[PDB]
Symmetry: D3
Subunit: 132 residues, 6 copies
């Protein structure tokens, strides 16, 4: 049934003026905003916590640098099967119809993050909205 998931809108969305386009796609599939924060520049520690699973990868530092290179928005969305459904909406740069498939063409500059599972959603919401 009802789930909550964490979405980040990435600095490339701001640079390319695609913020509303992305949020609109999620809004049109009937998901609701439960919490939202705007960061002119996200604190690097939050970014590093968010991507901690990748801390050993060669791209870790470079990806973190990208993620602090402009604003981000962190959003908690709520709706039926929200985690999987918003993950599907995000898609990938190979899949037309999805956010990444229609709008992105890079492995790193890919516009949006959505939690990939129940456990990561719980964790990511606590990173960005520790108040709850």
């Amino acid at each position: 049934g009802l789930q909550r998931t964490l979405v980040l809108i990435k600095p490339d969305a701001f640079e390319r003026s695609l913020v509303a386009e992305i949020m609109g796609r999620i809004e049109k599939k009937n998901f609701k905003i439960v919490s939202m924060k705007f960061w002119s520049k996200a604190p690097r520690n939050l970014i590093e916590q968010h991507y901690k699973e990748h801390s050993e990868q060669s791209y870790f530092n470079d990806n973190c640098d990208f993620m602090v290179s402009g604003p981000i928005i962190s959003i908690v969305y709520e709706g039926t099967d929200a985690i999987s459904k918003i993950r599907r909406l995000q898609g990938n740069i190979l899949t037309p119809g999805t956010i990444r498939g229609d709008l992105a063409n890079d492995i790193r500059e890919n516009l949006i993050h959505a939690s990939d599972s129940e456990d990561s959603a719980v964790d990511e919401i606590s990173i960005w909205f520790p108040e709850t």
Copy 2:
């Protein structure tokens, strides 16, 4: 050559959410034409039960009928090349972005649109909603 007609229902949730034109527009943009169309402020329960006759022994049957009479519906006959399968693909499902249900719906009952799933289904459904053959 491959011209067909199919039956589409715009469901009550489309009216509630103001997505009627959005749904019709996706079909229009794929080059399918309206042949017949009726607006129902409330569809007769009898038509709904015949439409979903194949589901009559399913647990969800009565609740789905209740939903389908909870608000207006539009019944439309569309015409074009391979209309039945093409409009079914346009309809899609709530798991497939790019489709009507995939982009716009998030429930397996409140899913905005019905489209006939076969030549047999289309003949039958068109007869139900547009008996004036």
Copy 3:
């Protein structure tokens, strides 16, 4: 407060695949469909009744011919101040932002009709939906 008005979607809208675009503009301003009929070809008598105020004008017959040259949809819309508001949405070919202003460029092939007053709305609804 609440009013009802009559809209015709004209044959040029069908020809140019702008039916949903036009209906969408009205739907987005929060007006509701109360009645609707699709005519593969409108009976000429209905068209002549609809435009009876113009029966003496030089363009009368030609306009009627246009209006039976393809399908039309007749719709009764309901909402606050519906008559004036939908009239404003229709606009004219000189006014960007409006249906005619954005999408039409002809005196006759202008996509949509909307009732111009309380009296004509009453009359036009009775022409297209005599049942009520």
Copy 4:
């Protein structure tokens, strides 16, 4: 040169009607940038009353406050050339197609968006919603 900041509220009716992104998108497309933004599941009555202080003696004051706390709101500070008047023009009114209110609203209370109407108003409203100057 002519850079300004202005305060925008996305009202509860925008959430009810799923028009939040549509409204924000129109401002984004005009090349204005978000400087600050807060989501309120329910805005404090006190902030709403200060925001509409100039209307406090009007007959519609209490009802408008009730509406403004009936659902979520988003408060946003936008920045750009001539932002105050430009975003006010984007806001428009329910009589003017091409604008947010003109295209999307049909009520003088439930009208989707507020934008500051002057430099004085903007300073005051930004202070109310983003006191952390």
Copy 5:
């Protein structure tokens, strides 16, 4: 009143990925492309001729610089009352519903040029499409 007019899509439209959005607004109003050229970087001389009337203004040189700062597209559009109608579609940064009204917020970076009169359209078409 069939007419032809000259449109430039400016470098800011390319920078902001608004080329199709702009062309679409003209397309939806039923104006037809008669000829079109893409310039990765327009020859400065063409720009100087195009804005010749402004050669005495203080902004001339800076405006020319902007106009060669990225690609442009030059288009001849044809349709009824095309000069006036496409001029109106262009609008200004103060008028929502128009191209500049919805999309631009600068006096120089304003996305599109459209001929403002019969004489200037003739002149501008001769500049960008001399083969004519």
Copy 6:
């Protein structure tokens, strides 16, 4: 993996006023125009070369006729993995989310051509843009 690919916008796109819609989908995926030509009516020889591989098929002549039945635009697009990505964007009439999937419903009148491989892109670019 920066690449260039050749796109044709076909006469049905002009007939149906879908030119900007099609170009917009490619623009939104962040691909850049490198060169572009508008043909009021393409020289038949260019069309015959373009579809040379089909010269033995029964549909060759009729397809060529269609391709000169109205204007076309020839475009060289540049971007990461452009050939494959724009090919995927084109899609087919069975796959919603793609250009053909959302907008076309015919085997011949299918709105757009995009190069299907490295070799064909090289070849097709040489046909429409020999100056290259």
